[model samples]
Target chain A: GIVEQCCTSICSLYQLENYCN
Target chain B: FVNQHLCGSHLVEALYLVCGERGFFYTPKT
Candidate 1:
Protein backbone atom coordinates (compact mmCIF):
# COMPACT_ATOMS: atom_id res chain seq x y z
CA GLY A 1 0.00 0.00 0.00
CA ILE A 2 3.02 2.24 -0.24
CA VAL A 3 1.99 3.44 -3.66
CA GLU A 4 -1.45 4.38 -2.42
CA GLN A 5 0.03 6.32 0.44
CA CYS A 6 2.44 8.00 -1.93
CA CYS A 7 -0.45 9.00 -4.15
CA THR A 8 -2.14 10.62 -1.18
CA SER A 9 1.03 12.55 -0.47
CA ILE A 10 1.09 13.77 -4.06
CA CYS A 11 -2.47 14.90 -3.67
CA SER A 12 -1.56 16.80 -0.57
CA LEU A 13 1.35 18.39 -2.39
CA TYR A 14 -1.15 19.94 -4.79
CA GLN A 15 -3.20 21.43 -1.93
CA LEU A 16 -5.59 18.57 -1.85
CA GLU A 17 -5.30 18.24 1.89
CA ASN A 18 -8.69 16.67 2.43
CA TYR A 19 -8.32 14.06 -0.29
CA CYS A 20 -7.02 11.34 1.94
CA ASN A 21 -9.77 11.88 4.49
CA PHE B 1 18.54 -2.01 -5.87
CA VAL B 2 18.26 1.25 -7.83
CA ASN B 3 15.50 -0.18 -9.99
CA GLN B 4 12.74 0.47 -7.46
CA HIS B 5 13.88 4.00 -6.91
CA LEU B 6 13.86 4.65 -10.64
CA CYS B 7 10.46 3.10 -10.97
CA GLY B 8 9.03 5.15 -8.13
CA SER B 9 10.45 8.34 -9.53
CA HIS B 10 8.96 7.61 -12.91
CA LEU B 11 5.66 6.76 -11.33
CA VAL B 12 5.50 10.04 -9.45
CA GLU B 13 6.51 11.95 -12.57
CA ALA B 14 3.83 10.24 -14.59
CA LEU B 15 1.25 11.08 -11.97
CA TYR B 16 2.37 14.67 -11.91
CA LEU B 17 1.99 14.90 -15.66
CA VAL B 18 -1.40 13.30 -15.59
CA CYS B 19 -2.56 15.51 -12.72
CA GLY B 20 -1.29 18.69 -14.35
CA GLU B 21 -0.61 21.97 -12.53
CA ARG B 22 -4.25 22.75 -11.88
CA GLY B 23 -5.23 19.29 -10.78
CA PHE B 24 -6.04 20.38 -7.25
CA PHE B 25 -8.76 22.72 -8.51
CA TYR B 26 -10.73 19.77 -9.74
CA THR B 27 -12.09 17.37 -7.13
CA PRO B 28 -13.17 13.87 -7.91
CA LYS B 29 -16.31 12.41 -6.37
CA THR B 30 -15.63 9.61 -3.94
Candidate 2:
Protein backbone atom coordinates (compact mmCIF):
# COMPACT_ATOMS: atom_id res chain seq x y z
CA GLY A 1 0.00 0.00 0.00
CA ILE A 2 1.06 3.56 -0.51
CA VAL A 3 2.74 5.11 2.48
CA GLU A 4 0.54 8.10 1.84
CA GLN A 5 2.34 11.21 0.72
CA CYS A 6 3.26 13.28 3.74
CA CYS A 7 5.43 15.64 1.64
CA THR A 8 6.96 17.55 4.51
CA SER A 9 9.12 20.54 3.76
CA ILE A 10 11.31 19.46 6.63
CA CYS A 11 11.82 15.97 5.21
CA SER A 12 11.44 16.74 1.50
CA LEU A 13 11.64 19.83 -0.63
CA TYR A 14 7.86 20.33 -0.56
CA GLN A 15 4.97 19.31 1.66
CA LEU A 16 1.19 19.02 1.80
CA GLU A 17 0.91 22.32 3.64
CA ASN A 18 2.34 23.96 0.55
CA TYR A 19 0.21 22.06 -1.96
CA CYS A 20 -3.11 21.32 -0.37
CA ASN A 21 -5.60 24.12 0.15
CA PHE B 1 7.19 12.41 -8.51
CA VAL B 2 9.92 14.57 -7.01
CA ASN B 3 10.81 18.11 -5.99
CA GLN B 4 9.70 20.61 -8.62
CA HIS B 5 7.85 23.76 -9.47
CA LEU B 6 6.81 26.65 -7.33
CA CYS B 7 10.20 28.27 -7.44
CA GLY B 8 8.95 30.77 -4.88
CA SER B 9 6.58 28.69 -2.80
CA HIS B 10 7.24 25.37 -1.07
CA LEU B 11 4.05 23.72 -2.25
CA VAL B 12 5.27 20.79 -4.32
CA GLU B 13 2.19 19.58 -6.11
CA ALA B 14 0.18 20.01 -9.26
CA LEU B 15 0.57 23.67 -10.11
CA TYR B 16 -1.15 25.64 -12.87
CA LEU B 17 0.91 26.71 -15.84
CA VAL B 18 -0.15 30.02 -17.34
CA CYS B 19 -0.79 28.94 -20.91
CA GLY B 20 -1.36 32.53 -21.77
CA GLU B 21 0.16 34.65 -19.01
CA ARG B 22 -3.22 36.37 -18.95
CA GLY B 23 -4.67 32.83 -18.88
CA PHE B 24 -3.68 29.74 -16.82
CA PHE B 25 -2.45 26.14 -16.95
CA TYR B 26 -4.06 22.68 -16.98
CA THR B 27 -4.31 19.41 -15.06
CA PRO B 28 -3.31 16.11 -16.66
CA LYS B 29 -5.51 13.05 -16.34
CA THR B 30 -5.28 9.30 -16.94
Candidate 3:
Protein backbone atom coordinates (compact mmCIF):
# COMPACT_ATOMS: atom_id res chain seq x y z
CA GLY A 1 0.00 0.00 0.00
CA ILE A 2 2.77 2.44 0.96
CA VAL A 3 5.16 1.32 -1.74
CA GLU A 4 2.41 1.77 -4.26
CA GLN A 5 2.30 5.48 -3.46
CA CYS A 6 6.05 5.63 -3.02
CA CYS A 7 6.38 4.37 -6.60
CA THR A 8 5.80 7.79 -8.07
CA SER A 9 7.83 10.38 -9.91
CA ILE A 10 8.10 12.78 -6.97
CA CYS A 11 9.18 10.17 -4.47
CA SER A 12 11.20 8.34 -7.06
CA LEU A 13 12.90 11.48 -8.30
CA TYR A 14 13.77 13.03 -4.94
CA GLN A 15 15.67 11.16 -2.27
CA LEU A 16 13.47 11.00 0.83
CA GLU A 17 15.50 11.86 3.90
CA ASN A 18 13.04 9.63 5.73
CA TYR A 19 11.26 6.60 4.35
CA CYS A 20 7.74 7.82 3.53
CA ASN A 21 7.70 10.53 6.11
CA PHE B 1 16.97 21.47 -12.63
CA VAL B 2 13.85 19.95 -11.12
CA ASN B 3 11.66 22.12 -8.98
CA GLN B 4 11.39 21.35 -5.27
CA HIS B 5 8.03 22.61 -4.12
CA LEU B 6 6.90 22.39 -0.54
CA CYS B 7 5.45 18.93 -0.68
CA GLY B 8 3.28 18.36 2.33
CA SER B 9 1.13 15.28 2.93
CA HIS B 10 -1.58 16.50 0.57
CA LEU B 11 0.87 17.97 -1.87
CA VAL B 12 2.62 14.64 -1.99
CA GLU B 13 -0.61 13.01 -2.99
CA ALA B 14 -1.11 15.47 -5.79
CA LEU B 15 2.43 14.79 -6.94
CA TYR B 16 1.24 11.34 -7.88
CA LEU B 17 -0.18 12.84 -11.06
CA VAL B 18 3.25 13.88 -12.19
CA CYS B 19 5.31 11.30 -10.30
CA GLY B 20 2.93 8.35 -10.37
CA GLU B 21 3.80 5.69 -12.91
CA ARG B 22 1.54 4.96 -15.80
CA GLY B 23 2.37 1.28 -15.52
CA PHE B 24 4.90 -0.29 -13.13
CA PHE B 25 7.83 1.74 -14.35
CA TYR B 26 8.21 4.81 -12.17
CA THR B 27 11.35 6.85 -11.61
CA PRO B 28 13.14 5.75 -8.44
CA LYS B 29 15.31 8.01 -6.27
CA THR B 30 18.72 8.37 -7.79
Candidate 4:
Protein backbone atom coordinates (compact mmCIF):
# COMPACT_ATOMS: atom_id res chain seq x y z
CA GLY A 1 0.00 0.00 0.00
CA ILE A 2 2.86 2.33 0.75
CA VAL A 3 4.50 1.67 -2.58
CA GLU A 4 1.28 2.31 -4.43
CA GLN A 5 0.59 5.55 -2.61
CA CYS A 6 4.14 6.71 -3.06
CA CYS A 7 4.14 5.94 -6.74
CA THR A 8 0.73 7.49 -7.24
CA SER A 9 1.79 10.62 -5.44
CA ILE A 10 4.95 10.77 -7.48
CA CYS A 11 3.04 10.52 -10.72
CA SER A 12 0.68 13.29 -9.64
CA LEU A 13 3.53 15.43 -8.43
CA TYR A 14 5.12 15.23 -11.86
CA GLN A 15 1.78 15.78 -13.54
CA LEU A 16 2.10 12.41 -15.22
CA GLU A 17 -0.89 10.17 -15.77
CA ASN A 18 -1.03 7.00 -13.72
CA TYR A 19 -0.40 4.00 -15.93
CA CYS A 20 0.65 1.52 -13.31
CA ASN A 21 -1.26 -1.72 -13.09
CA PHE B 1 16.53 12.95 -18.66
CA VAL B 2 13.87 12.15 -16.10
CA ASN B 3 11.88 15.18 -17.23
CA GLN B 4 11.43 13.57 -20.57
CA HIS B 5 7.88 12.30 -21.02
CA LEU B 6 7.56 8.77 -19.67
CA CYS B 7 4.69 6.58 -18.65
CA GLY B 8 4.06 6.73 -14.91
CA SER B 9 4.04 2.95 -14.70
CA HIS B 10 7.53 2.77 -16.17
CA LEU B 11 8.79 5.35 -13.75
CA VAL B 12 7.25 3.50 -10.84
CA GLU B 13 8.73 0.21 -11.97
CA ALA B 14 12.20 1.70 -12.35
CA LEU B 15 11.96 3.41 -8.99
CA TYR B 16 10.72 0.24 -7.40
CA LEU B 17 13.73 -1.73 -8.65
CA VAL B 18 16.16 0.92 -7.47
CA CYS B 19 14.48 1.21 -4.09
CA GLY B 20 14.51 -2.55 -3.73
CA GLU B 21 18.22 -2.71 -4.42
CA ARG B 22 19.05 0.29 -2.27
CA GLY B 23 16.58 -0.57 0.51
CA PHE B 24 14.94 2.81 0.88
CA PHE B 25 11.64 4.50 0.34
CA TYR B 26 11.49 7.41 -2.09
CA THR B 27 8.92 10.07 -1.39
CA PRO B 28 8.72 12.72 -4.03
CA LYS B 29 7.91 16.30 -3.16
CA THR B 30 4.21 16.87 -2.76
Candidate 5:
Protein backbone atom coordinates (compact mmCIF):
# COMPACT_ATOMS: atom_id res chain seq x y z
CA GLY A 1 0.00 0.00 0.00
CA ILE A 2 1.67 3.13 -1.23
CA VAL A 3 -0.52 5.38 0.87
CA GLU A 4 0.44 3.65 4.08
CA GLN A 5 4.05 3.57 3.03
CA CYS A 6 3.97 7.25 2.21
CA CYS A 7 2.50 8.10 5.59
CA THR A 8 5.17 6.07 7.32
CA SER A 9 7.77 7.87 5.28
CA ILE A 10 6.30 11.20 6.34
CA CYS A 11 6.53 10.25 10.00
CA SER A 12 10.16 9.47 9.49
CA LEU A 13 10.48 12.70 7.62
CA TYR A 14 9.18 14.87 10.46
CA GLN A 15 11.55 13.03 12.74
CA LEU A 16 14.39 13.98 10.44
CA GLU A 17 13.22 17.55 10.24
CA ASN A 18 12.98 17.77 13.98
CA TYR A 19 16.76 17.61 14.08
CA CYS A 20 17.36 19.60 10.91
CA ASN A 21 17.15 23.06 12.35
CA PHE B 1 7.44 13.14 -9.56
CA VAL B 2 5.22 13.47 -6.55
CA ASN B 3 3.71 16.73 -5.37
CA GLN B 4 3.62 15.35 -1.86
CA HIS B 5 7.37 16.00 -1.78
CA LEU B 6 7.01 19.72 -2.34
CA CYS B 7 6.93 20.59 1.34
CA GLY B 8 10.53 19.66 2.02
CA SER B 9 12.32 21.28 -0.89
CA HIS B 10 10.33 24.51 -0.68
CA LEU B 11 10.95 24.90 3.01
CA VAL B 12 14.62 24.15 2.59
CA GLU B 13 14.70 26.76 -0.13
CA ALA B 14 12.93 29.26 2.10
CA LEU B 15 15.29 28.47 4.96
CA TYR B 16 18.20 29.27 2.70
CA LEU B 17 16.56 32.43 1.45
CA VAL B 18 17.93 34.40 4.33
CA CYS B 19 21.17 34.29 2.40
CA GLY B 20 19.52 36.08 -0.44
CA GLU B 21 19.82 39.52 1.14
CA ARG B 22 23.06 38.83 2.93
CA GLY B 23 26.38 40.33 1.93
CA PHE B 24 26.54 37.99 -1.01
CA PHE B 25 23.64 37.25 -3.29
CA TYR B 26 23.39 34.71 -6.08
CA THR B 27 21.82 35.48 -9.43
CA PRO B 28 21.05 33.43 -12.48
CA LYS B 29 20.69 34.50 -16.08
CA THR B 30 20.23 33.05 -19.51
Candidate 6:
Protein backbone atom coordinates (compact mmCIF):
# COMPACT_ATOMS: atom_id res chain seq x y z
CA GLY A 1 0.00 0.00 0.00
CA ILE A 2 3.01 2.28 0.03
CA VAL A 3 2.48 3.45 -3.50
CA GLU A 4 -1.21 4.03 -2.91
CA GLN A 5 -0.62 5.99 0.26
CA CYS A 6 2.15 8.10 -1.22
CA CYS A 7 0.03 8.76 -4.28
CA THR A 8 -2.75 10.06 -2.07
CA SER A 9 -0.43 12.35 -0.15
CA ILE A 10 1.03 13.73 -3.34
CA CYS A 11 -2.43 14.21 -4.74
CA SER A 12 -3.39 16.24 -1.70
CA LEU A 13 -0.83 18.84 -2.64
CA TYR A 14 -2.13 18.90 -6.16
CA GLN A 15 -5.58 19.58 -4.80
CA LEU A 16 -4.18 22.39 -2.73
CA GLU A 17 -2.83 24.10 -5.80
CA ASN A 18 -6.30 24.33 -7.31
CA TYR A 19 -7.90 25.23 -4.02
CA CYS A 20 -5.39 27.94 -3.29
CA ASN A 21 -5.63 29.38 -6.78
CA PHE B 1 12.73 -3.69 7.52
CA VAL B 2 9.89 -1.41 8.58
CA ASN B 3 12.55 1.22 8.06
CA GLN B 4 11.55 1.12 4.45
CA HIS B 5 8.07 2.25 5.35
CA LEU B 6 9.34 5.26 7.23
CA CYS B 7 11.62 6.23 4.39
CA GLY B 8 8.84 5.85 1.92
CA SER B 9 6.98 8.54 3.79
CA HIS B 10 9.93 10.82 3.43
CA LEU B 11 10.12 10.17 -0.29
CA VAL B 12 6.52 11.21 -0.67
CA GLU B 13 7.06 14.33 1.42
CA ALA B 14 9.83 15.43 -0.88
CA LEU B 15 7.89 14.58 -3.98
CA TYR B 16 4.70 16.19 -2.75
CA LEU B 17 6.27 19.62 -2.45
CA VAL B 18 8.34 19.34 -5.59
CA CYS B 19 5.71 17.79 -7.80
CA GLY B 20 3.03 20.28 -6.86
CA GLU B 21 4.77 23.13 -8.64
CA ARG B 22 4.03 21.65 -12.06
CA GLY B 23 0.96 19.55 -11.23
CA PHE B 24 2.73 16.51 -12.58
CA PHE B 25 2.23 12.83 -12.04
CA TYR B 26 4.74 10.00 -11.68
CA THR B 27 4.72 6.79 -13.56
CA PRO B 28 6.85 3.70 -13.17
CA LYS B 29 9.94 3.72 -15.29
CA THR B 30 9.97 1.69 -18.45
TM-score of each: 0.30, 0.16, 0.23, 0.30, 0.24, 0.29
What is the per-residue lDDT of model 6 for residues B1-30, given as tens digits with 9 covering 90 to 100? 112222245644545565556643433231
Model 6 residue A14 lDDT score: 37
Per-residue lDDT value at A3 in model 2: 16
Per-residue lDDT of candidate 4, residues B1-30 (tens digit): 234333356655655544454443334443
Q: How does candidate 3 fare on TM-score?
A: 0.23
Clashes of 1: 0
Model 1 clash pairs? none
Q: List the residue pairs that clash in candidate 2.
A: A7-A15
RMSD of each candidate relative to the true structure: 10.5, 10.3, 9.8, 9.2, 11.4, 10.8
Error (Å) of candidate 4 at residue B29 is 7.7
- Candidate 2: tens digits of C-alpha lDDT, residues A1-21: 001332223222243223323
lDDT of 4 at B11: 59
Q: Residue B5's C-alpha lDDT in candidate 1?
A: 27
Name the runs in model 4 displaced over 4 angstroms: A1-21, B1-5, B21-30
Clash tally for model 6: 0
| Candidate 2 local Cα displacement, residue B24, angstroms | 14
Report the candidate with higher lDDT, 1 versus 2.
1
Error of 3 at B6 (Å): 7.7
DockQ of each: 0.08, 0.08, 0.08, 0.07, 0.05, 0.06
Candidate 1 structure quality by residue, lDDT tens digits, A1-21: 334434334332323222223
Clashes of each: 0, 1, 1, 0, 0, 0
Question: Which of the two candidates, 1 or 6, achieves a greater DockQ against the reference?
Answer: 1
Model 3 lDDT, full chain set: 0.37
Q: Global lDDT of each model?
A: 0.36, 0.27, 0.37, 0.41, 0.32, 0.39
The model with the greater TM-score, 1 or 2, is: 1
iRMSD, model 1, in Å: 10.6
With a 3 Å backbone cut-off (N, CA, C), the pairs that clash in candidate 5 are none
Between candidates 2 and 5, the one scoring higher on DockQ is 2
